[PDB]
Structures are given as C-alpha cells and as structure tokens.
Design a protein around this ligand. Structure first.
Ligand code: ATP
Ligand code: MG
Lengths: 514, 464, 50, 333, 464, 50
C-alpha cells in the first residue's frame, strides 16, 4: 500500500516528547453510579475536564470545600478510591471544523463511526455566550422542511427554534430527517447563502436507531453535509447531557463563519433526564418531577445559541429543531412546558392524527410558528394564506359530515374543500417536496382545483400532477424557484396545465374529473 | 476585606467572608472568572447567611469557569440599576448593564432594585380610570390608573402593535413614559421588539430592560424588579405617569421557583416556591399610584395547562385589575387593536367607578356581541337567510358595533400615514349608544373600519 | 439497485481479502522497522541515546 | 460510489490498525530497552541528574475555628518565651490530659465549646473543675482556647491537642533536634504505613488509651533508636486519635513539625536512595521552584524505572521514566 | 488482606478493606453466613466506593444471618457465569450455579457479567420480518428477525402467556440457540416453561437462567446480565443465531430502585433511581445484534399501575424495534392475545419492507380501529342509531376486526380449551383486506372470536 | 397467578360474589379444574367478558 504504516509512527517517535510540567493532583475519595468525588485540585474550575488514570474523563461539576464531585464520561467502572486525578486546564471544549460533515461523533468530538480521525479546524468551549440582542437579526429566510404541513402552516425560518413535540412513534424523527434530506438541493447549488449544514444530535437513542437514521440520510444523499453527534443510551449520563452542547458548538463554528446550520436535538427529554440523573447523584436539591432548579436554564442556554446573526457577524444562522416526547400527549409536563416557552413555535404531532392517516400528523391549529409569514417565500405566503382558515373551518364543520344535504351551500363547499386540503397535507416518509412543488400543490387545493377530484384520489392527483409539471412544464417550477413568487402568467400556465391534466386523470372510482 | 468562594453548585455560590464583613442580604458581590474563553465578572446576589461567616448567593451569570478561593468583593449595596432620562431609548439587562451600548449609564444615579412599596398612607384610596383613548379599552374594559392589566395573546394577534399603541398613548396623551420589562425574553423576540420600536420611533419614549432566557434564573427573577425600579424613578422623581410592560410575569414566577429550588427550599403546592404570594406581592404592590402619579402595567400572563386555578396565575390575578384578551378571530376580521370584547374584562366596569351611562352602554354592547356570537354558528351552518328579521337586524348592528370597536391606532401611523385617533371617553359612550340603538345601521360596514369617533364615521360614510 | 448492491458486495469481499493480505505483507516490513522505531522512542523517553 | 468509499475506508482502517499494532510493538520494545538501560546504577544516577537539570529551568477548620486556633497559636507563642524543657514537657502532658478529659466528658467539652460570646461562665466552669490540678501556663493557654468560639465542639479538642503537640515541638526546638525529630517522625510514619494491622490497632480509640500507648511502646517507641521528642509526640498522638488514622495522623504530625519551622515537606519517589549530592541539589531546586525551604522525604520505588517524582502540597512534578513510558504508550495515534 | 462487614441494611452491605486492597467496582466478594438454618456463602457485588477504604455492596443472596465483623474476601473479578454449548439444556441462576444439576458448569469457560456494548461501528439496522403466525402481530406489529421486540403490559394481562407462545412459535423450529432469562418473574411459570421445553425437545437448544422474584434485589439486577452474557457468547464466539427471551425486564429497573435509597441515591420521579435511563441503557444496548451476528430478543416489559407514562416503560420504549402493547382494556373485552392494536407499533411496518399490500391493510385496520375508539364515546350515550351510515358501517367493521385480531394461541389452550392455530401472513393480509373492504359484514361478530384464519371463520360462522 | 377482582358495582347489581369476569382471570386455568368442569366451562369466562 504505502510506507506510511511505518512513517506515521516514525513521525510520532521523532515528534513525541513528554515534558515535565507541574500538575495539581486530586485523589478519588468516593465513586459510585457515574459520579466520582475528588479530594484536592484546589485550582480546579467549574465544569473543568478532569482526567483519571485509566484514560477516563470527568467534568468538575460540584465544587465544595471538601471535594470536587465530577460526572464521569464513560468507563466509570475503572474509577477507584485513591486514584490520581489530573486537571486539564480547559473547560469543556469540542473540536469543530468542516471535517465533521458526514461523521458520527460522540459528545467529545471523537469519531465513533470507525473511519479515520477528524481534522479539527479549531476548538470551541461548550459554554460560550450565545449571540446577544444587538448581534442578531430578524428571522426572514425560509428553511424549507419539505413537509407541506410545516412549510404552509408553521413555517420555519432559518434562525428560528421550532419544537417538534409529540408522543412516541408519532413521526418526529421522520419530520427532522425529512428536513435534513430536503437540504440536498440547496447543498448541490454550492452557494453558502443557500447551503444548510445539518447536525443530528441523537440523545438516548439506541445505536441501531442512530444507524438507521444514518442509513436514511446516506440513501438520501444527506450525509455529505450532515454530522451526527451521537450519545447512545449505552453512553454515560454525562454524554447524554453534553451531546446537545457538542452539536450546538459544531454548528456555532459554522454559524459564526457565515454558514447556515440546522440542529436537530432528538430528544431533549433525554437530555433533561440525564441532567436530572447527574444532579440527583450530586445531591443537588430537586424540584418538580425531581428536575434540578436550573433544568430550564439547561435547555434555554442551549436553544438560545440557535440565532440568526447580524450582517456584521457574517449573517449566518443556526436553526433549532428540538424534539420532545410528550407522555400521553401531556404538553403540560415540566420539560414540555419549559421548551414550549423557550422555542419560537411548535409542531404538535398527535398519535390520533397519525392513526387517522393524517401523517406527518401535525395538529394544525394547536401548532403555531411565531415567526410566521416572515419565514415563507412570497409564493407560499400568498398561496397558503387561506389554508389555515380553511382547515379551521373544516375542523369546526367535521361534526356535520353526515348531513351535507342540510348545510348551506357555502358550508358544504367549505367541508369539501377542507377534506381535500387535509388529504393534500399528507405526505409519504423520506420524500420531502421542494418549495416550488409545495407551492403548486397548495395552489391546487386553496384555489379550488381539487374540488372536482375525489378525496381518496387527491393524494394521487397531486403526486401525478407535479410529476407531470416537472417533466413537461418545468417553467412553472423554475419561475417559482428563481423569482420566489407565483407570477400571473405562470399562474395562468399552471391553471391551463392543471385543466389539461384533469382530462387525462382516471379517478380510482372510475369517474371523470373536469 | 474580601470574601472567598468556597462552594460552587451551578448558579449557587457560597462565599466565606471575614467575621466582621459579612454582606447583608441581597447585596451584589463581584467575582472574577479569569479563564480566557469564559472570562467574566460574576454578579452574585446574597440570598442566605449560612453561619460561620458564609453567605449563599445566586449567581446572576453562568458560573462555568469559576474557581474556589477566588476573591469576592462586596459592593455594599444590592443590585442597582441606572435611573434617569438617559435610560429611555436604550436596552438594559437585569443588572443595569446597557446591551446596545456597553458602558452606558455607569455614571447615572443608581437605584437599588429592592425598594419597599409606597407607605399605606400614601396610596390612592380611589380607583381612577385611565382614559387611554382606545374605544374598545375605554368602553368595554376600562383600564385602571395605577393598576395591572393582563394581556392575553400570542403571535399574529397584534400584541406588539398594541404595545406600541399604548407606548404612544402614554407618551403623548399623558406626557409619560414606558418601561418594557422583558422577563424571560426570547432573544429573537427581544431583538424584534427593539427594532420595531426603533423603526416606529417610539424607542425614545421607552426604556427596555431584557432579562433573556439564556441567563440563569437570578436575572430572570430580578429583571422585573429592575424595570419596576426605573418606572418608580420616573413616577417619584421625574413626576411622570409610567407604563410598565411585563412580558411574561409567569416567567418571573417560574424564575422565582427555580431560584427557590436551587437554594434548597421545600417546594409549595404545585412545585412553586413557598413564598410565591410574597414575591408576587412585593413585585406588584410597587405598581400603584402615589402622590398623583401612577405606574400602570400591562402584564402578559401565561396560564399553565390553561388552568386559572394554578398557583402562579391564581397569585397573579389577585393583583390584575383588567384583562385584555387579543383574539385571532377578531384579528382576521380586520378589527385592530384585535381585542376580544367578550373574553376581555375589567374590574372597574361597574356603575360606581364609571358613570351609569357608561356601564349601561357597555353592557348593551356586550349583550349585542354575545347574541351575535351565539348566532355565528347558525350563520356559518344554516346561512344568514335562516335567521329571523329581528336576528338579522341584531346581526347587522353587531357587525357594525364590533367593527366600530376597531380604531386607527397611532402605531399604524408608520404604515399608512393617517394620524391615530384619541377618541374621548364621552364621545365613545355616546357613539356606542347611537350604534346600539340602530342610529347608524344604514351605513355600510366598511364605513366603521379603523375610525375614531362620530366625526370620522360621518366623513368615511360620505367617502363611500 | 439489487444488481448494484450485489456487485458492490462482491467487490467489497474481494477487497476484504486483498486488504487482509496486503496487510500481512506490510505487517512484515512493520516488524522490520519496529526495532529502529523502538530504539528511537526509548532514546526520546530516556532523554539521551539508548 | 458508496462501495468505493467503503473499500477506501476499509483500506484506511487497515492502515490505522496496522499502525496501532506497530506502535504497540515499538513501545513494548522501548519498554524492554529502558528496563535494561535503567537497571544500571550509573545510568540511573545520570537519568535523575538529567531530571534535576530539567527542573533547574522551571487547614480543614472553618472560619471561626480557624481564627480561634490562630489566636491560640499566638498565645502559645507568647507563653513559650518563658518556658523550660521540663516546663514544656509538663505543659504538653497537661494539655494532653485536658484533651483526654474533654473527650471523656462529652458534656464538659460541649459547654466548654459552646459558641457563646460570654467567656466568664465558661472560664468559671473551667477553673472550677480544673484550676488547682494543672500548672499556670497550661491554664493560660488552656483557657484562651475555651474563651474563643469554635465552629464545632470537636475543634476545641483539636485546638488543645494542637497546642499539646507544639509544646513538644518547642521542646525539640529547645534541644535543637528539629532534624532528628522530623526524621524519626517520618520513619515512624512509613513504618505505620506498612503493616496496616498495627495502624488499625492504634486507631481504635474505643479501647483504653493506655493499652494503645503500651502497644506502641512495645512495637515502635520502646527501643533506644526512638528520639525522646518523637516518642513523646507518638505517645500523645496514640492517646488522642478519636477515630483518625494512625499513619494518617503521624504523617500529618510530621507535616506540622516541618511547618512549624517554616519548611514544607516534599514527598519524593525514586528508583533508589540517591546520594547526598543530587539530594542537596534537589532540595535547592525545589526551594527555588516554590520559594520556601523544603525537606525532601524519599520513598523506595524501583518500579519507576530509574526516574524521580516529587509531590508537595497539591502539586506534583513527575519525571518517573515509568510515567513517561506510559505517556508514550497512550500517546500512540 | 480480607475485608470486614461494618454495616448491613437489608440487601446492602458495607465492607471495610485495608487501604491497599479496596476492590474495584462490580467485583464479587464472598462473605459467609454460619447460622445453621441459613448457612451459606453470600456473594456481594461492589456497587460504590464510599471512602475511608469502605465499599458498599448489593448482596445476591439474602443477608439474613450475616454478622457484623465477618471476614469478606475479594474474588478479584466481577461475577462470572459459565458460557459455551454446555449451558444449553440446563437451568442456571444469576450466579451461574446450575440448578437442575448442581456443580455442572463449574469447569466451563467463565465470562464476566459486565462488558461494554458493541461499538457503534458494528451496528446495522435489521429489517427482516419474523413471521410468528399471530394475526395481530404479523399484521400490525411485525417482528424483526435479529431486532428487539417487547411485550408491554400491565399486571396480569397475558405477558407470560404471550411470551411462552412466542417461544412456541419462534424457537421450536429455530436452528440456533435460545436463551431465556427469567428476570423477577413467577417461579411457577418458569417451571412450566422448563417442562414445556423439555417435552418438546427444545431444551437441548435452550439455556435457562432464572432470577425469580423470590430472590433479593441483587439477583433480580444481575440475572438479566448473566443470561445476556451467555447470549453474547453465542453471538460473538460462535456465530449462531440466538433468541433471547427475557421476562420481565422491568424487574431489572425495579430491583435497581429497590436498592437505590440504600445506596444513598436521591430518588427520582415516581421513586425510581436517578440512574434509571443509564442503567437500563447499558443492558438494553448489550442486547442489540451486530452485523453478521443476530440476537432476536423478546422482552416482556411490565408497566406499573397500567400507566404507560411511567418512567420505566417510557424509557424502555426507545430501545425496541417492535413493541406489542397489551392493555387491560382489551383484556377485559375478552380479546386474547390482549394486544392494543393502536398503541402497539413496529419499525419494520413500512411499505418498503412488508410490501404495499400489507402496509395498506395494516394502516386501514388501524384507521378503522381509531375511528371506532373515537366513536365509542358517542355510542355509549347517544346510541349507535344516531351515527352516520358510513360511521355505523365502520363500527360494525371495527368490532369484527377487533375480534378477528383475537386468536387461539397454542400456549393458551388452558385458557380456552381449544387447540392453537397458526395463520400465514398472506392469509392474514387477505382476511383483513376482506374485512376492511366489507366481504364479511354479513357474518356475526362472535364468529370472529378466537378462530385464527379464514377457514376457521367459515366453520365458526356455519356453527352459528 | 390470577385475580378475582370483586367489584362493588357488580355486588350492588346482585352479581354476588361480584367477580368482574373481564378483569378476573386464573392463569393456571383449566389445569386447575376437573375434566368435566374444564369441558363444560372451557370458554365461560371469555363468553361472559364478551
Ligand atoms: N409521513 C409519514 N408517513 C408514513 N409513515 C410515517 C410518516 N412519518 C413517520 N412514519 C412512520 O411512523 C413510525 C414512527 O416514525 P419515527 O421513527 O419518525 O417516530 P418518532 O416520533 O421519532 O418516534 P420514536 O420515539 O420511536 O423515535 C415509523 O414507522 C415511521 O416510518
Ligand atoms: Mg424518534
């Protein structure tokens, strides 16, 4: 192969030199359940990185006059009473650089995917200040998630902090993986003003689930701009606590360098659980649901790194998509309440909607985005303006589905429109839609072109129509993409092509749609 | 003489002082984090005396990087905030540091944020209505001078536009000022508010005091007190009526709860701090009218689990004199300021504080609007034509009333150019008396949109 | 897709074998240079020529 | 392309694992080389001399108890000016006796230790129960101690016991045997570090103190090699542990002995007992580094592969060739 | 240099060692109880180092009879269990001592019960369906070959019956090695499983490790690890496909909670230990399958208080590929296997793996059942007659679908008398497509109860 | 090994001794019955739950 098999080692032996620097030592006096108390280390600083004899690492987290209670970062069983603990003079820091794209790294920045090392451009402390009020800018650029429901009803603008919140197996990781996949078109442009770099932080997930997500991203082409900061359930509570901060630091390095980042925390509930475990093991006073007093701060300190920077700082942005698992759809629990308060908007996913087939299962109405239309392109803003009111009216009218003969003409029309809009917002997994396709699809429904298609066929009628437009009338898509608005001539062309397609469309019931 | 940090458990920092120099409670102490990446000057607020010359403090800034044995210097006074005309037009944090212009106000007069409420003999024994000039507020839910107003709402319901409107009205009609106490701000929302106020040119009449969410709970708990201290200086020294916004005073309660948990105090009923009512009282009692000048406050309130019996909202509402609820449904109908006439309420809408004519007209308007809200279901399902003639007449009158509750706000002047209207209370009362009696049921509905008073109604009708 | 997966799997195993051996070959040169590398490392740690 | 990247990553994995194996073999060979090289005595001496050349280029009491103990130490310093060797021995014995009394009479210790500001009542209890039974110097210090407030009751005992030790140390100062007493204290400390059964037997304070003192005399201090001051200090300690470790206590006593004389003990570990030349060089370099006279105490540790390690205070200066070899091993890419 | 017992509190024993001989964590220590009635060698596991040369240990056998001051000797290594093909066909306890043949594996290779999970580099997702023959499982919660499967349930809803049925449906024909870890389950059912396996000649290919609930917390903690060590040996050192049945994995976390407060840990929510997630994560991650080495693990999970929001089941959910979820609501209605079709889920139920037909039928069944669940509130009060015609037809569909998901399982012959049945996946898909589409609306609903297949449906309909 | 969940509501209805057939169960089941009883009442509990 090459001489490097020896040469590298040579470079080490020629370059290696363990010099004799003075060091402050502590001694482990207690050790149990992932926490080690270290007597000594007079000059240790809070959240410092202590190194234990067996190559183990810990974070000096409680400092008393007697001992330093440190949370051990893995390999806890190798810690014993009387062991020597050396202090590294550095607060928690992680390497950061463009080399992390396509890599799976543990919360310390060390690769765990089995490939080579990562060439770090720099190091960032996990607890650096978030951008201040004066350093930010109004959220005004869309971050197309590719999910019609989110992009139409609760748009996410880069610089925003949108919470995907819902019970288990409701479609959250699916939504965030779809969002990551949707950025491939932006990535292939090569324009940093469009490129979105993704950081999927997995907290408390099993290794095979992280592997499944990585496979979904690779088969979708998203792994060339995505890093996976993985803290699998096998990892110590310290890693589950640090993983969001690791991912946030890796993203922040790009963000301050003019790039746009997309951070997915999945989940922050397990982050909170790991922090609770650490706090209770350190005997910090408990509160509601046993969480420490500063658990809110734990999440806030994190999510407030996700900001859009002013043009003086390069204009980069970091978008947060924390994922929270709500038990029995109880959004009033402690952590859900905290993160709903922190975040700028909420996609509430419900298992009832998932089973009804409303998957991706965003409960529109209850779901909100405080950034609003500022996070939408003009085409989607104008097309999807009436969508929310139509869906609200449909949910009001749903009790009348059996008496459509007895309702007013306008009410029955609203019911029929709403059913088709609901079918329109449905979307298959791992298949995000470009913003132009979403614009055309929502245009079909809001403008009434689906009013003739049967409900059960709407999903197909959309899917084919776009498949037609892309292949034959791409001028519409190109116009929407390049100009960001649905021009009148483009709208007329779109209506003409919709009508032409209607004639050739075979409804599943055998009827004709014109 | 200077203390030494002996314990650091997250935000909680214990400081050992020489026996003769233990700082008294709520004093601000300064510690230095010399680590390069996290270099800082921590402001620790003395919270307890533990004995043996130890004091337990809540760090107002993240304690990461703090080292045991680092010198802690006592300032000798509690957290002090700059006060004066200079605070107007600038954004401050809970500790009085200017965020948009660092080092600004460090040479102003500084006031401790821990001030007793007015003496009992100095309080105003009679509630006085605040004629803000908005038709909806002045008629349906009159505000209380020196009182507290809950501001229920959200995104896209014009809460920020209403805040701008009230800032303009307090600055222009009453010759007063405003202090925006951003407890638990989303830094994005805080920046948006700062730029909106600067663009509207009302920033010069408002002092912003943001305690962001990213800061530890000490600052989120003390920011309301800091902003209220600026408001108190304006009230007592400058002699100005003040308008203290507090978005969101649930945060303040929750920051108090988190601080209580950190200090080790046993949680109360629903996990709230045992002294919840006393903290809320110590905050709210200072918002009152004294010696002819008043601090009014519009305090956005979050209701956990939508449960008004929860300890936090239950304690908050013991002090709230009025309740303005902004509605998405009303906002979508073009009816700015977007106040829901039925969900909103006031505790001064009584025949005694307001005139009997005022109460009668307000109750008639409420009755009409409630009957219309009931008929909305029939209109939406069965159609307008399925109503009776009396029902159709009432529907027309209610449409016109609810559209006349809209107004050309001063905050909208920046968008359209039309000066905002300040409808006198008497004019609003007589105008709505005319509306409820059908004297204007023959004008088109578009005539009633965004117009202050009968003169504007007539002019717009003639313009259609 | 199935054909590509099968051919890539066959290529991978072919490569796994070739690597394996290539590694054994190199393992030899490795054991030849181990003596010099160890001598250099010992000299470095001792602070003087071994 | 994914398969191409897979084979490329397999190649890189092979390169990395072969390099890891080569590095492991290389440092294992270097370990053998150094083990052979360190065994020489001249080579070992040269290595430690090189380490010294490299170096050439370089309290648990809380506030109230801390201040009270400082005041008591100041009072002892004031009194010691007029003391005598026999008087100092009597002072030490009586201070130990009052320490025993306080330990036995828990209620007596608790009221003599209450944090009350009023000293008159306390002193009244004191003399009432002990005035005619002890000398004057003893009471003077033995009261100063009672007057001052203490964070905890036990601290008061730790105060008087502390003085009880100083009385003996001052005696060593009177006779000029500071070096001899320190050396004997460290010898006894290392002896008690070994044979932990003896340390545990001495530690047990439930058994009568006289039995522990007799055991110590039969084992350690009953032989002519024990210095008088060191033997007295050990007997007093064995009499006043109160659950503390014997080896722990005696090494702390030696640290106090050196501290009284302004020096700080630096525990040094070496492969062999270095000669006096590099010993005095080590003392000078350590004092220069820390700006304070140091007393080096050696410990036999051939496992250090001919290197030298120092630990003073909370700081360490490690140049042990074993530690350097471990650093080289773990530093392999 | 042996230790000495200082402090005994139930299952927790504190041991003081000489300074240089404090054992490492998770080491096995041997004390001796000499009282005649309870004489034994007591195995402790070092759980904490507590300082002053003390360690705190969790006793594996009951501490009744242990005396303070008794010599405790350190084994120098963690608890080791026998491994190899010898373990197959025998019953072991948590300590690796054979029950059906005492002293049997004492000479086998011994592996520590504690080992790190396989590295993330060696994990790949599993997407191969395991056909069990149960209609509900095969249709709505398809199991993954080499994946992680769970049978959640309340108390006494049929977890043991269903896990025994899965042993009957998966292991009887299995060519590899099976391991059954009875973690704090009932000893009667363990013996029943033992005799059932012996009669079916599956015992020769099955290793049983029992830590049943009569045992103290230590065994109920370490028995799952002891069995998982045998499973891991078969996975790694032999490459045989392995089945790993565990019943009940909740008892692991419950034993950890039982010893939690005696170990000095502050209790977390609902009284669980703070280390719930990490402790369970280590064990669960050791169970995964690595590429080319398959472990098909099925874990009966107990849900305390029938509350699926309880921290233990909620945290366990993240560790599983397929999760059948038995519910007392379905059990009350007579449906056996008692699966909640809506709450249960599987990751392999995607159109790309099970096919478009299977996926469509499963999603239509779930849709019908969810609509039925939403309507049950209306039906109980307003009556079925007031529903829409489409909704009425859907309700009739859904009742039959719920009853058709019931099946006469082989392991439940003593629950129903009738023998068990096996339904091919194709037949299940066809039958449910017919139901959801209507081909069976004319048959009585009781014809769909405990039948298992279309032929049985026809026969029972004719018998009605 | 089973439950006999006695219900107050059933007790008042005159269903004495109050066995809630749905919740109640015996996991020993037919093995703890004589063959005549097993044959006669094989599905009785499930029939009553339905
Ligand atoms: N839009 C969708 N259309 C169809 N199936 C979907 C959709 N979104 C998710 N699913 C399926 O729903 C199930 C749950 O998906 P996912 O893994 O994203 O859930 P989650 O909310 O992240 O839950 P978990 O807590 O298990 O991680 C998976 O089978 C996924 O394939
Ligand atoms: Mg997920």
């Amino acid at each position: 192969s090459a001489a490097d098999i020896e040469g590298a080692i040579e470079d080490y032996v020629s370059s290696f030199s363990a010099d004799t620097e003075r060091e402050e030592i502590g001694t482990v006096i207690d050790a149990g359940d992932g926490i080690a108390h270290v007597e000594g280390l007079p000059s240790v600083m809070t959240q410092e990185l202590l190194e234990f004899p067996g190559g183990v690492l810990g974070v000096a987290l409680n400092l008393d006059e007697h001992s330093v209670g440190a949370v051990i970062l893995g390999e806890f069983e190798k810690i014993e009473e009387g062991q020597q603990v050396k202090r590294t003079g550095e607060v928690l820091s992680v390497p950061v650089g463009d080399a992390f794209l396509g890599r799976v790294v543990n919360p310390l920045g060390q690769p765990i995917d089995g490939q080579g090392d990562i060439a770090a451009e720099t190091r960032r402390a996990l607890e650096l200040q978030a951008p201040s009020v004066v350093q930010r800018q109004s959220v005004s650029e869309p971050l197309q998630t590719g999910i019609k429901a989110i992009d139409a009803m609760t748009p996410i603008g880069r610089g925003q902090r949108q919470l995907i919140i819902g019970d288990r197996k409701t479609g959250k990781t699916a939504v965030c993986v779809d969002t990551i996949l949707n950025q491939r078109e932006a990535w292939l442009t090569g324009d940093p003003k469009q490129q979105v770099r993704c950081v999927y932080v997995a907290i408390g997930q099993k290794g095979t689930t992280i592997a499944s997500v990585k496979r979904a991203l690779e088969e979708g082409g998203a792994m060339e701009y995505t890093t996976i900061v993985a803290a699998p359930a096998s990892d110590a509570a310290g890693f589950k606590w640090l993983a969001p901060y690791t991912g946030s630091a890796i993203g922040q390095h790009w963000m301050y360098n003019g790039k746009h980042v997309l951070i997915v925390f999945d989940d922050l509930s397990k982050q909170a659980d790991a922090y609770r475990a650490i706090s209770l093991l350190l005997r910090r006073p408990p509160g509601r649901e046993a969480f420490p007093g500063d658990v809110f701060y734990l999440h806030s300190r994190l999510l407030e790194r996700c900001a859009k920077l002013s043009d003086e700082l390069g204009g980069g942005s970091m978008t947060g998509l924390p994922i929270i698992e709500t038990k029995a759809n109880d959004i009033s629990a402690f952590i859900p309440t905290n993160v709903i308060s922190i975040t700028d908007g909420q996609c509430f996913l419900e298992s009832d909607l998932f089973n009804q087939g409303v998957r991706p299962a965003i409960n529109v109405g209850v779901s909100v985005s405080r950034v609003g239309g500022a996070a939408q392109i003009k085409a989607m803003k104008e097309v999807a303006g009436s969508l929310r009111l139509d869906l609200s009216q449909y949910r009001e009218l749903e009790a009348f589905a059996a008496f459509a003969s007895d309702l007013d003409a306008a009410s029955k029309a609203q019911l029929d429109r709403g059913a088709r809009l609901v079918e329109l917002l449905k979307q298959p997994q791992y298949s995000p839609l470009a913003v132009e396709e979403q614009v055309v699809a929502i245009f079909l429904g809001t403008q009434g072109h689906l009013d003739s298609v049967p409900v059960e066929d709407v999903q197909r009628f959309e899917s084919e129509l776009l498949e037609h437009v892309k292949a034959s009338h791409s001028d519409i898509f190109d116009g929407i993409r390049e100009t960001k608005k649905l021009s009148e001539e483009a709208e007329e062309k779109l209506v003409s092509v919709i009508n032409e397609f209607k004639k050739g469309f075979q409804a599943s019931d055998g009827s004709s749609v014109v | 003489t200077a203390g030494r940090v002996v314990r650091i458990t997250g935000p909680v920092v214990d400081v050992e002082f020489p026996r003769g120099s233990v700082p008294e409670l709520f004093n601000a102490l300064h510690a230095e984090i010399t680590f390069g990446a996290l270099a800082k000057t921590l402001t620790l607020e003395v919270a307890q005396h533990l004995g043996d010359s130890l004091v337990r403090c809540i760090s107002m800034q993240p304690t990461d990087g703090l080292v045991r044995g680092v010198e802690v210097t006592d300032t000798g006074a509690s957290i002090s905030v700059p006060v004066g005309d200079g605070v107007k037009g600038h954004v401050f944090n809970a500790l009085g540091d200017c965020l948009d212009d660092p080092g600004y106000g460090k040479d102003f007069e500084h006031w401790s944020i821990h001030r007793k409420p007015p003496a009992f003999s100095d309080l105003e024994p009679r509630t006085e209505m605040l004629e803000t000039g908005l038709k909806v507020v002045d008629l349906l839910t009159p505000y209380v001078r020196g009182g507290k107003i809950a501001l229920f709402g959200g995104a896209g319901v014009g809460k920020t536009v209403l805040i701008q409107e009230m800032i303009n009205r307090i600055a222009r009609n009453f010759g007063g000022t405003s202090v925006f106490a951003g407890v638990g701000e989303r830094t994005r929302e805080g920046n948006d508010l700062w730029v909106e106020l600067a663009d509207a040119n009302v920033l010069k009449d408002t002092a912003l005091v943001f305690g962001q969410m990213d800061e530890p709970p000490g600052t989120r708990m003390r920011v309301a007190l800091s902003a209220l201290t600026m408001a108190e200086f304006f009230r007592d020294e400058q002699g100005q009526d003040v308008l203290l916004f507090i978005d969101n005073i649930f945060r303040f309660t929750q920051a108090g709860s988190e601080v209580s948990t950190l200090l080790g105090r046993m949680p109360s009923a629903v996990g709230y701090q045992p002294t919840l009512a006393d903290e809320m009282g110590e905050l709210q009692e200072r918002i009152t009218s004294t010696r002819g000048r008043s601090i009014t406050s519009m305090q956005a309130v979050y209701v956990p689990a939508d449960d008004y019996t929860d300890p936090a909202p239950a304690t908050t509402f013991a002090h709230l004199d009025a309740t303005t609820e902004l509605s998405r449904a009303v906002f979508s109908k073009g009816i700015f300021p977007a106040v829901d006439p039925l969900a909103s309420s006031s505790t001064i809408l009584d025949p005694a504080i307001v005139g009997d004519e005022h109460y009668r007209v307000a109750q008639e308007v409420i009755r009409i609007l409630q009957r219309y809200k009931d008929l909305q279901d029939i209109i939406a399902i069965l159609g307008i034509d399925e109503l009776s003639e009396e029902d159709k007449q009432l529907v027309n009158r209610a449409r016109r009333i609810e559209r006349f509750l809209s107004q050309n706000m001063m905050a909208a002047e920046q968008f359209t150019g039309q000066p905002g209207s300040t409808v006198p209370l008497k004019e609003t009362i007589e105008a709505f008396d005319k509306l409820t009696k059908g004297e204007f049921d023959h004008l088109p509905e578009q005539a009633f949109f965004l117009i202050g008073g009968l003169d504007d109604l007539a002019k717009k009708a003639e313009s259609l | 897709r199935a054909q590509a997966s099968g051919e890539v799997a066959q290529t991978l195993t072919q490569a796994d074998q070739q690597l394996s051996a290539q590694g054994d070959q190199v393992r030899s040169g490795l054991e030849s240079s181990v003596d010099g590398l160890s001598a250099k490392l010992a000299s470095r740690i001792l602070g003087v020529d071994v | 392309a994914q398969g191409a990247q897979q084979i490329q990553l397999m190649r890189q994995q092979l390169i990395r694992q072969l390099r890891t194996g080569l590095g492991a073999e290389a440092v294992n060979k270097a370990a053998e080389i150094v083990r052979a090289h360190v065994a020489d005595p001249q080579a070992q001496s040269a290595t430690v001399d090189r380490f010294l050349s490299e170096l050439e280029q370089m309290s648990r009491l809380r506030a109230a108890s801390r201040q009270s103990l400082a005041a008591l130490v100041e009072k002892f310093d004031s009194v010691a000016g007029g003391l005598d060797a026999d008087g100092l021995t009597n002072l030490a014995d009586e201070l130990a006796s009052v320490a025993k009394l306080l330990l036995s009479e828990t209620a007596l210790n608790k009221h003599l230790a209450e944090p009350t500001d009023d000293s008159a009542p306390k002193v009244r209890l004191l003399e009432r129960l002990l005035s005619d039974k002890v000398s004057a110097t003893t009471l003077d210090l033995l009261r100063t101690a009672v007057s001052n407030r203490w964070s905890t009751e036990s601290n008061l005992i730790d105060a008087v016991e502390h003085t009880a030790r100083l009385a003996l140390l001052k005696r060593a100062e009177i006779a000029g045997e500071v070096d001899e007493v320190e050396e004997q204290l460290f010898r006894f400390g290392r002896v008690l570090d070994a044979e932990p059964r003896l340390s545990a037997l001495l530690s047990d304070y439930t058994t009568p103190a006289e039995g522990r003192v007799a055991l110590l005399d039969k084992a350690l201090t009953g032989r002519p090699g024990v210095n008088q001051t060191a033997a007295a200090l050990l007997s007093q300690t064995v009499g006043l542990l109160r659950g503390e470790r014997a080896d722990e206590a005696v090494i702390d006593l030696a640290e106090l002995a050196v501290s009284r004389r302004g020096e700080v003990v630096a525990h040094v570990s070496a492969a062999a007992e270095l000669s006096d030349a590099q010993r005095t060089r080590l003392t000078e370099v350590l004092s220069r580094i820390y700006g304070r006279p140091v007393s080096v105490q050696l410990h036999v540790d051939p496992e250090l592969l001919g290197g030298l390690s120092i630990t003073v205070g909370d700081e360490v200066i490690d140049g042990s060739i074993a530690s350097r070899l471990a650093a080289a091993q773990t530093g392999l890419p």
